[PDB]
Short mmCIF file of C-alpha atoms and ligand atoms in Angstrom, two decimals:
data_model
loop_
_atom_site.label_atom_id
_atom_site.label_comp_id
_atom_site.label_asym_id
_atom_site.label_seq_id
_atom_site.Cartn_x
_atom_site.Cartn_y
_atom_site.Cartn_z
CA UNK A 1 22.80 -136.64 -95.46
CA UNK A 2 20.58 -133.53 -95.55
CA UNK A 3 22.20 -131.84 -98.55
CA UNK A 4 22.98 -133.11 -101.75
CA UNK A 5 26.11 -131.38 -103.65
CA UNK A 6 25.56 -129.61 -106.83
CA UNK A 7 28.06 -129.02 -110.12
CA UNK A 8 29.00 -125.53 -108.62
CA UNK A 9 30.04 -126.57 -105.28
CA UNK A 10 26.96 -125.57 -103.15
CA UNK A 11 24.89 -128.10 -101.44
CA UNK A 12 21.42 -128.15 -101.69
CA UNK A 13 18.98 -129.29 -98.94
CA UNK A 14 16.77 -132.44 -99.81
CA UNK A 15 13.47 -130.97 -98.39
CA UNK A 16 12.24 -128.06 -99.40
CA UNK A 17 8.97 -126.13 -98.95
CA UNK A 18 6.76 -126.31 -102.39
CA UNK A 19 4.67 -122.71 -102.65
CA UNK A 20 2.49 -123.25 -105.67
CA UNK A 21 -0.78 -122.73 -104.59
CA UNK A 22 -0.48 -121.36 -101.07
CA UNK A 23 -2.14 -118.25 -101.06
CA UNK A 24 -0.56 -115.12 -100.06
CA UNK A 25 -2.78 -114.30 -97.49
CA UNK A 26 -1.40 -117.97 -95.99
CA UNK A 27 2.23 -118.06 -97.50
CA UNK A 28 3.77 -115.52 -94.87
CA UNK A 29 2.88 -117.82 -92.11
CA UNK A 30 3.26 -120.99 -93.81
CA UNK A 31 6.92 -119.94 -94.41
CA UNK A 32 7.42 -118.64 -91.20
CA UNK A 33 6.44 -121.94 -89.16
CA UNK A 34 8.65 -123.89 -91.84
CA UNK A 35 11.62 -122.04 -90.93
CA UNK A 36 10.96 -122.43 -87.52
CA UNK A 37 10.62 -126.22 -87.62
CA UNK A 38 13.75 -126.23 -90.24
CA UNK A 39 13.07 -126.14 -93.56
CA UNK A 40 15.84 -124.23 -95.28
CA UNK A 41 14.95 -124.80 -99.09
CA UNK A 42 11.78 -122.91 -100.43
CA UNK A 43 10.84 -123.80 -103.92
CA UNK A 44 9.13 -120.52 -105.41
CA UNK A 45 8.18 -119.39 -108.68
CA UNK A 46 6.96 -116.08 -110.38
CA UNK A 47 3.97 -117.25 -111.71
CA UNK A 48 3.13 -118.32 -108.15
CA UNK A 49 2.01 -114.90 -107.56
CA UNK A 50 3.05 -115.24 -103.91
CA UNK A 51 6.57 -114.04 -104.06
CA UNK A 52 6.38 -111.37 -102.48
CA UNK A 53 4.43 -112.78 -99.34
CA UNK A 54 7.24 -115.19 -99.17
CA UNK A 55 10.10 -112.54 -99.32
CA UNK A 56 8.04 -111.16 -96.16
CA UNK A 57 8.83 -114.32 -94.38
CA UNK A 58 12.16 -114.88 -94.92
CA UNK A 59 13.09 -111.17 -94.08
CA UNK A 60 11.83 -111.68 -91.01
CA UNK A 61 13.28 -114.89 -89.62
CA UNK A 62 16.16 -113.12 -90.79
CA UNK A 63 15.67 -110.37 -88.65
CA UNK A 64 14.35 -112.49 -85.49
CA UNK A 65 18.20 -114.71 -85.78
CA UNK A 66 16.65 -117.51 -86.44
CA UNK A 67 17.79 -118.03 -89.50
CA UNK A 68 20.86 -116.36 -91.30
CA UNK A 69 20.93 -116.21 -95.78
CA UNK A 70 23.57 -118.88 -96.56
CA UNK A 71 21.87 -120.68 -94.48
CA UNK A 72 18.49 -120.83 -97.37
CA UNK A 73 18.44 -122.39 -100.37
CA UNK A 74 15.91 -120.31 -102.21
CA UNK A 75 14.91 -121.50 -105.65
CA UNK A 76 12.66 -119.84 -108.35
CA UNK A 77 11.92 -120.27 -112.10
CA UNK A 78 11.31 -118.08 -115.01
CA UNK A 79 8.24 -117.77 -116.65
CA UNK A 80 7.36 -119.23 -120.25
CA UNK A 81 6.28 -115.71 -121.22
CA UNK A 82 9.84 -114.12 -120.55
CA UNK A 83 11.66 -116.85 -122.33
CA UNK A 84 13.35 -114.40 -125.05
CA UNK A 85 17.03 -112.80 -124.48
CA UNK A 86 16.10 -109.57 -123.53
CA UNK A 87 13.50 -110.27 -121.01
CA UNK A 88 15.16 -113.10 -118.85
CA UNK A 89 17.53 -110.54 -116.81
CA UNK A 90 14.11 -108.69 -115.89
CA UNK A 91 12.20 -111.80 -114.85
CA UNK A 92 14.75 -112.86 -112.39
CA UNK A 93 15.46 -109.14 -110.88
CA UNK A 94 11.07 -108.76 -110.38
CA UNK A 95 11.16 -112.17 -108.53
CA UNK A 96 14.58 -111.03 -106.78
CA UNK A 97 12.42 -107.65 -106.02
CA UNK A 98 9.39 -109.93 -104.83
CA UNK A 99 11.71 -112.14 -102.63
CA UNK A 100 13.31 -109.27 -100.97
CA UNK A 101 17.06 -111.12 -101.94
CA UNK A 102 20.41 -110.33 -104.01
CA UNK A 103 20.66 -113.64 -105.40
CA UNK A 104 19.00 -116.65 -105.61
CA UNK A 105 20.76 -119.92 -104.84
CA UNK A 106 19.09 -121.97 -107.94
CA UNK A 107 17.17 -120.65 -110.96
CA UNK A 108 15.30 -122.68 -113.09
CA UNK A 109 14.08 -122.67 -116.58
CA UNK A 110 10.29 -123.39 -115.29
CA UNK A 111 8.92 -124.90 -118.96
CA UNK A 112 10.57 -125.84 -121.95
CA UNK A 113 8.07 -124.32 -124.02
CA UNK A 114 8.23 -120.18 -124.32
CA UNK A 115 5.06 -118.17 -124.87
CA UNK A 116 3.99 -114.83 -126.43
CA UNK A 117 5.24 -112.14 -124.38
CA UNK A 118 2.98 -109.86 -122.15
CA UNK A 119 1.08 -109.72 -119.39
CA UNK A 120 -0.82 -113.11 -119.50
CA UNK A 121 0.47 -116.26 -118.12
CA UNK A 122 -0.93 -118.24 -120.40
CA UNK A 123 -2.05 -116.12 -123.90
CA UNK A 124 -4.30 -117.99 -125.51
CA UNK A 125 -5.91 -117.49 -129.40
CA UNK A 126 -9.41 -117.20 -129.92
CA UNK A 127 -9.83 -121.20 -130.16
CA UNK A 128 -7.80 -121.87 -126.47
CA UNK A 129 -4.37 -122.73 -127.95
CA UNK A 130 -1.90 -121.55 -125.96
CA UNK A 131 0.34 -118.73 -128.28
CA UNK A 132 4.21 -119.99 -128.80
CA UNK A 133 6.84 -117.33 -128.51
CA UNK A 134 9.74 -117.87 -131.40
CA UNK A 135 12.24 -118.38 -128.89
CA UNK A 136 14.43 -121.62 -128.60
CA UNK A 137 15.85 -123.56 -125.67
CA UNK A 138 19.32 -122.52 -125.97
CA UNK A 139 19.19 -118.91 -126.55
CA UNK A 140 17.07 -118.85 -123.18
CA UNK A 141 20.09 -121.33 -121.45
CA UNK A 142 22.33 -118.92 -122.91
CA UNK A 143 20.88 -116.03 -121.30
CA UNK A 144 20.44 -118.02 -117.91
CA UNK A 145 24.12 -118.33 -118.03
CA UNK A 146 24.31 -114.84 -118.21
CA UNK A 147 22.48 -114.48 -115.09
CA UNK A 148 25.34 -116.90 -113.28
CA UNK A 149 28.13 -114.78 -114.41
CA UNK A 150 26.25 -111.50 -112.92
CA UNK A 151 25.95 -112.83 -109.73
CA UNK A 152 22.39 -113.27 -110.01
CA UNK A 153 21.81 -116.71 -109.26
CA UNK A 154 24.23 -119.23 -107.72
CA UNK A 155 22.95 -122.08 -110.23
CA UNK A 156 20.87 -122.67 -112.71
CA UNK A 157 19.18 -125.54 -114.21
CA UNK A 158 15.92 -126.72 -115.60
CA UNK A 159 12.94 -128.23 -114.97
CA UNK A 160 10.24 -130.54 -117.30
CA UNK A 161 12.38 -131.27 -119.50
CA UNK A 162 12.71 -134.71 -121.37
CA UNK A 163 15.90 -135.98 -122.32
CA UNK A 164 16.22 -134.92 -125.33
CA UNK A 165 15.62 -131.54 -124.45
CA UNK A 166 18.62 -131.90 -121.31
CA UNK A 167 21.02 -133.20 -123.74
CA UNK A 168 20.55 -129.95 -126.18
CA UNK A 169 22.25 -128.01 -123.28
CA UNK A 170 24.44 -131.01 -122.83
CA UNK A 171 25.59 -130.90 -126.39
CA UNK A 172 25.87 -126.69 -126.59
CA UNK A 173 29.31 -126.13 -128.19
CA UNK A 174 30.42 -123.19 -126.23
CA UNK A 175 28.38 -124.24 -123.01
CA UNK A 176 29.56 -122.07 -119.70
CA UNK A 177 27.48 -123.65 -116.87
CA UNK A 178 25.90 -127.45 -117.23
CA UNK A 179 22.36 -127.35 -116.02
CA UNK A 180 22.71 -128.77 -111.84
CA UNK A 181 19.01 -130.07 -111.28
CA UNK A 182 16.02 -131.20 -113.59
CA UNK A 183 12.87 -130.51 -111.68
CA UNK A 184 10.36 -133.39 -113.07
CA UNK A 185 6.85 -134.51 -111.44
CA UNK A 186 7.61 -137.57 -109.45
CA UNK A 187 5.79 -139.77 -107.32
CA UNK A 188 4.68 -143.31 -107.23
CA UNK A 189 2.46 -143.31 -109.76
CA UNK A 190 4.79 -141.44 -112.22
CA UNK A 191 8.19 -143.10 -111.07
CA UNK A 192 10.73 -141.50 -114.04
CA UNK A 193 12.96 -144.15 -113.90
CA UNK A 194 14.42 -143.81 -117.20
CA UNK A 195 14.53 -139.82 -116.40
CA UNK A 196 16.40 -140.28 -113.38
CA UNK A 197 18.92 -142.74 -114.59
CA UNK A 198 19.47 -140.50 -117.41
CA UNK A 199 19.67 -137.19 -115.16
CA UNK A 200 22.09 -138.67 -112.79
CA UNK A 201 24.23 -140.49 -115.29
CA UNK A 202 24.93 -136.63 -116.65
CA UNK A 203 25.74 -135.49 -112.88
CA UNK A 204 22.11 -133.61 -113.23
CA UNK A 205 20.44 -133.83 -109.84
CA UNK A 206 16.63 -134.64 -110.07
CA UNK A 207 13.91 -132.27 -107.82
CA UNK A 208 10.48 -134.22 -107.11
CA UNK A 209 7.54 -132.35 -107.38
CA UNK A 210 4.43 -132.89 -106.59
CA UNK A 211 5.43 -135.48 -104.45
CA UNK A 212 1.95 -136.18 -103.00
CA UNK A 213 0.20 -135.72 -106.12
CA UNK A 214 -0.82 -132.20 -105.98
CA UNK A 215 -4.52 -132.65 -104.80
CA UNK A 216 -5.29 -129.16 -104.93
CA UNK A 217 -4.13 -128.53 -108.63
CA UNK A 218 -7.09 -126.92 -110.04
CA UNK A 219 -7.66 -129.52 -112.97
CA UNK A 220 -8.08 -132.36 -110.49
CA UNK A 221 -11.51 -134.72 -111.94
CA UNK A 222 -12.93 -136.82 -108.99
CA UNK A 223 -12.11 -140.15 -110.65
CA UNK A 224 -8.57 -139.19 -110.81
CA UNK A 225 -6.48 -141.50 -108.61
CA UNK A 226 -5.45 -140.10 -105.47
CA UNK A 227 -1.74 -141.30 -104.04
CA UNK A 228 -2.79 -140.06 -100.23
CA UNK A 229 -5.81 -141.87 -99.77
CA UNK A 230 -4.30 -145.00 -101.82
CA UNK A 231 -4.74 -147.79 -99.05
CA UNK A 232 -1.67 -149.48 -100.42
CA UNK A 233 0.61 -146.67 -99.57
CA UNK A 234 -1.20 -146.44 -96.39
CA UNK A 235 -0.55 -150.00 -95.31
CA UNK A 236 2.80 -149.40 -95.92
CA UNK A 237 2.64 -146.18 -93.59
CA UNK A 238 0.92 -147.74 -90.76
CA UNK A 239 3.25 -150.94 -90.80
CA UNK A 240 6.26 -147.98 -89.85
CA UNK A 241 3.85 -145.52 -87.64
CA UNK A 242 4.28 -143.03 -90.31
CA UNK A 243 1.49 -141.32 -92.24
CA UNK A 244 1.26 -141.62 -96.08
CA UNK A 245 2.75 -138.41 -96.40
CA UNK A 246 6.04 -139.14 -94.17
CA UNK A 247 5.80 -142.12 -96.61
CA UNK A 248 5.43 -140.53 -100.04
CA UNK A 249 8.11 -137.76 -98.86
CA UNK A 250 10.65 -140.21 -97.90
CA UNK A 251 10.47 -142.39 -100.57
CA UNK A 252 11.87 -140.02 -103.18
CA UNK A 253 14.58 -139.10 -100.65
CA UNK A 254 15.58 -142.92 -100.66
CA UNK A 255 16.38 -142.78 -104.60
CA UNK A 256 19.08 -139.38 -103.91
CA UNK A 257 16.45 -136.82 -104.96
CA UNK A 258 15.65 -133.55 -103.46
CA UNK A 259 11.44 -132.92 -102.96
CA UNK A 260 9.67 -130.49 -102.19
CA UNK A 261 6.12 -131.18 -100.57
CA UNK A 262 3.98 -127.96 -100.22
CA UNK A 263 1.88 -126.70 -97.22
CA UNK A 264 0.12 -124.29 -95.60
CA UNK A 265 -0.86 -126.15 -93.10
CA UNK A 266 1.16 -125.91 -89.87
CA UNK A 267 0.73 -129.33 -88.29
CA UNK A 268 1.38 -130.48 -92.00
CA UNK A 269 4.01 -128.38 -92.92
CA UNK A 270 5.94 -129.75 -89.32
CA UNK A 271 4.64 -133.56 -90.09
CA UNK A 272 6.10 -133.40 -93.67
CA UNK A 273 9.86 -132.66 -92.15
CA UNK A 274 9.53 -135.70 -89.51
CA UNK A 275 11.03 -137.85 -92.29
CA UNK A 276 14.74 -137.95 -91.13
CA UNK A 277 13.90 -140.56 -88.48
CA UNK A 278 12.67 -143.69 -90.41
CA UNK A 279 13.95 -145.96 -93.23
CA UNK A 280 11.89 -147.17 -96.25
CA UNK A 281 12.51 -151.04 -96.76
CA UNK A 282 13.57 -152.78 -99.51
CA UNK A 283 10.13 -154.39 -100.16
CA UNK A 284 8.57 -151.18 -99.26
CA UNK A 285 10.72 -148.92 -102.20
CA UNK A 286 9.99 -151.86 -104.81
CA UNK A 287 6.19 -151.95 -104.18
CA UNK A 288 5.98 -147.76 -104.58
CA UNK A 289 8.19 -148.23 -107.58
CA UNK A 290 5.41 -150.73 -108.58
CA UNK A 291 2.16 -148.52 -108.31
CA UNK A 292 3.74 -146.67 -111.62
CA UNK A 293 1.01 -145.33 -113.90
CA UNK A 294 3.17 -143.00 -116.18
CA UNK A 295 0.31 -140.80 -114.86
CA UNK A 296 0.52 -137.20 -114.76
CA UNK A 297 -1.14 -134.14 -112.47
CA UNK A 298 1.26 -131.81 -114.37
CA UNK A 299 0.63 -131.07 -118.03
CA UNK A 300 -1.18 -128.22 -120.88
CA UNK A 301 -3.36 -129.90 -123.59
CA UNK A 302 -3.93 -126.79 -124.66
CA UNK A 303 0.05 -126.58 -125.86
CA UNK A 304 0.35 -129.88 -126.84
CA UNK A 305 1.34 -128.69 -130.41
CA UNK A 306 4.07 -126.06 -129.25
CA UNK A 307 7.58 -127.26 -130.78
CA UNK A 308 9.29 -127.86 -127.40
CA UNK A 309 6.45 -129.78 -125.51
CA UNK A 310 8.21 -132.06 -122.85
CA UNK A 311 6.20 -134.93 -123.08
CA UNK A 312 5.70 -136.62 -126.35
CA UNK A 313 8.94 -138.43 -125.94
CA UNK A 314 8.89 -141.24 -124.19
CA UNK A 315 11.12 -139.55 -121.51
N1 NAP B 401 8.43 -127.12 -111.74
C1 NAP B 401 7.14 -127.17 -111.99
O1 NAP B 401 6.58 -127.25 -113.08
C2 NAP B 401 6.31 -127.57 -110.75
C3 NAP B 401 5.04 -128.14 -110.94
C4 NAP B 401 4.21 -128.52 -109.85
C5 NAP B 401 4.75 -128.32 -108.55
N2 NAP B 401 6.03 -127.74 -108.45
C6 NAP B 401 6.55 -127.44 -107.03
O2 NAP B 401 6.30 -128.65 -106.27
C7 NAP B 401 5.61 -128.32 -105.03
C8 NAP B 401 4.85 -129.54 -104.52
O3 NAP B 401 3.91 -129.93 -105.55
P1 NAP B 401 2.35 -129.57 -105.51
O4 NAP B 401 2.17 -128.28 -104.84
O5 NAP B 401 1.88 -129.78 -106.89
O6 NAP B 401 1.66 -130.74 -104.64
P2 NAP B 401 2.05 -131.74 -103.45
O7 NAP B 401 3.16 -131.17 -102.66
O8 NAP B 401 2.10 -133.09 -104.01
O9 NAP B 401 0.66 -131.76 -102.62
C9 NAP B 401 0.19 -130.54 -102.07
C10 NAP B 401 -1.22 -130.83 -101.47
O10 NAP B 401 -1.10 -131.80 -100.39
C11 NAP B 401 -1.63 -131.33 -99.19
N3 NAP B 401 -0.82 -131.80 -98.09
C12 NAP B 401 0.44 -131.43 -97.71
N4 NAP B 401 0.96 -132.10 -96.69
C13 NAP B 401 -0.06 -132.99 -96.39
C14 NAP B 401 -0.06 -133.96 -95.38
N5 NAP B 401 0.92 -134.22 -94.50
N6 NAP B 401 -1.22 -134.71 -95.29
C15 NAP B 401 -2.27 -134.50 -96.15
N7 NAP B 401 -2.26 -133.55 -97.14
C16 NAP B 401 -1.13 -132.79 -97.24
C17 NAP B 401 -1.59 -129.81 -99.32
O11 NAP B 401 -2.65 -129.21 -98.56
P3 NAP B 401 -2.46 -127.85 -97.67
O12 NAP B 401 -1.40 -127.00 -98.33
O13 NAP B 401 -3.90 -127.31 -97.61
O14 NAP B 401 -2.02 -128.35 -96.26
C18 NAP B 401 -1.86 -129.55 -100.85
O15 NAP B 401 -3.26 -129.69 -101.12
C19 NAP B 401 4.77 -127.10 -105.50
O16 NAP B 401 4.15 -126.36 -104.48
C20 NAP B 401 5.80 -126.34 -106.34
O17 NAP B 401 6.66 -125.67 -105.42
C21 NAP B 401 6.86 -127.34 -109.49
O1 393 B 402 3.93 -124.96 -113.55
C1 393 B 402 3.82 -125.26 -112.36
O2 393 B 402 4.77 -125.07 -111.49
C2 393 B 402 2.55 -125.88 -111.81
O3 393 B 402 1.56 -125.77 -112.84
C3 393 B 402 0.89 -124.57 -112.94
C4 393 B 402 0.94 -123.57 -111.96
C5 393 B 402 0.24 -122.37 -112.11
CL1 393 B 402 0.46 -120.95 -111.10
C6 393 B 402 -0.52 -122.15 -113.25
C7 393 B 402 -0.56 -123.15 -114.20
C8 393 B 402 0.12 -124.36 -114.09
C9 393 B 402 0.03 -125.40 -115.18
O4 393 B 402 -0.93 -125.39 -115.97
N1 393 B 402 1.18 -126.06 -115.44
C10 393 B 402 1.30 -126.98 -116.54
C11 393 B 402 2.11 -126.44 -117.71
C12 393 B 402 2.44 -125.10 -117.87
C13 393 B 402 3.19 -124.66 -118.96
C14 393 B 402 3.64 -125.56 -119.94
C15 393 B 402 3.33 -126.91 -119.78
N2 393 B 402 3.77 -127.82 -120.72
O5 393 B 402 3.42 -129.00 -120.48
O6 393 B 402 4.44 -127.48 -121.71
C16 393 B 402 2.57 -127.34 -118.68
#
């Protein structure tokens, strides 16, 4: 199946569009051609900066017929920096603004960790520690909650988050809405098994990102491995006429995740959805599962201290 079906009904497509790092001058487009080739699940995010340029696009496939809105499945995350109370209503009515939408179909809880409030991203302190906010995990669940029963957001859930930190909103006395997906990195050299298995024992459905290892993340070092150009994974792509990409995409769709490659590429962006027309073997999901590493494109020395930090725990 295409769709996977959440805790509030709604059924969310397995491959979506990733937007972190497409440029705005490149996102309109980018979205655009996805649409056209039938994507229907964008993954966004505020601190993407390119909200807006990705509103632009859906408003106009709207407008051409191409698509129609219940059609989408549009998902965004607030930002560390808005994590207290009072500021979470406002985060997800700017990136509403930016999207051009009246509700979003998932809303995510981007970090565990909150940080100082303002204008910066990231605040640092003099010495390049990133500056905590005093604000707790499930005050900010509780106001996400809040943004369900407005008619905000259709669902909301989480993303890197350890276990641990998933069963604190599990374990909420006076819970309203169980978190409906855990967005984690997840590829084959950082498989998650014990994530997964604990995510989908608690009906919690698990988001890959950075399914091809995020190349392009801005902290890359040269002698960092590189999943597309690993001739194991190619082998395996040749052997089904594939390219490692098809392969790397349709390997987390094989263990009943959703992922979201990103694009701005057109040829790429269509080649990435050409995944609905081959099958992964047996040997061939057992050998990715292999290449594990427990290595990870997506993580902040610089607030390894903070309280909440995801990934001290084993998972
Ligand atoms: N929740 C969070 O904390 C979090 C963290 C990281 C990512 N995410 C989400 O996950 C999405 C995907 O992760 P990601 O952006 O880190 O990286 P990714 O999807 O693993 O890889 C993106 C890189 O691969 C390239 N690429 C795409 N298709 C390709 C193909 N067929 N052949 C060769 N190269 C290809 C892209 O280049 P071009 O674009 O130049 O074509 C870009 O450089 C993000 O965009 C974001 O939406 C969420
Ligand atoms: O977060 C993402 O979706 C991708 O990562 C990005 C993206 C942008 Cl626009 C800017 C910076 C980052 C980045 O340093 N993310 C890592 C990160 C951040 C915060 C906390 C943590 N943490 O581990 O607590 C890690």
């Amino acid at each position: 199946a295409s769709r996977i079906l959440l805790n509030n009904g709604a059924k969310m497509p397995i491959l979506g569009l990733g937007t972190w790092k497409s440029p705005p001058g490149q996102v309109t487009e980018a979205v655009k051609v996805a649409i056209d080739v039938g994507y229907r699940h964008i993954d966004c995010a505020h601190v993407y900066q390119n909200e807006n340029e990705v509103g632009v696009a859906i408003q106009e496939k709207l407008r051409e017929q191409v698509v129609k809105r219940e059609e989408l499945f549009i998902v965004s995350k607030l930002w560390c920096t808005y994590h207290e109370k009072g500021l979470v209503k406002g985060a997800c009515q700017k990136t509403l603004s930016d999207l051009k939408l009246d509700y979003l179909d998932l809303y995510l809880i981007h970090w565990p960790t909150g940080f100082k409030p303002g204008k910066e991203f990231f605040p640092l302190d003099e010495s390049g520690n990133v500056v905590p906010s005093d604000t707790n995990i499930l005050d900010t669940w509780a106001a996400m909650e809040e943004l369900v029963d407005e008619g905000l957001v259709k669902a909301i859930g989480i993303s890197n988050f350890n276990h641990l930190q998933v069963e604190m909103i599990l374990n909420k006395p006076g819970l309203k809405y169980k978190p409906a997906v855990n967005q984690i990195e997840c590829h084959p050299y950082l498989t998650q098994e014990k994530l997964i298995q604990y995510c989908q024992s608690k009906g919690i459905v698990v988001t890959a990102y950075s399914p091809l290892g995020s190349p392009d993340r801005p902290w890359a070092k040269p002698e960092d491995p590189s999943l597309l150009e690993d001739p194991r994974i190619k082998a395996i792509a040749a052997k089904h006429n594939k390219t490692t990409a098809q392969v790397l995409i349709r390997f987390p769709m094989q263990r009943n995740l959703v992922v979201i490659p990103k694009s701005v590429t057109p040829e790429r962006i269509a080649e990435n959805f050409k995944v609905f027309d081959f099958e992964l073997s047996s040997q061939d999901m057992t050998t990715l599962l292999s290449y594990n590493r427990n290595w990870r494109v997506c993580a902040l020395l610089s607030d390894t201290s903070h309280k909440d930090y995801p990934f001290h725990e084993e998972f």
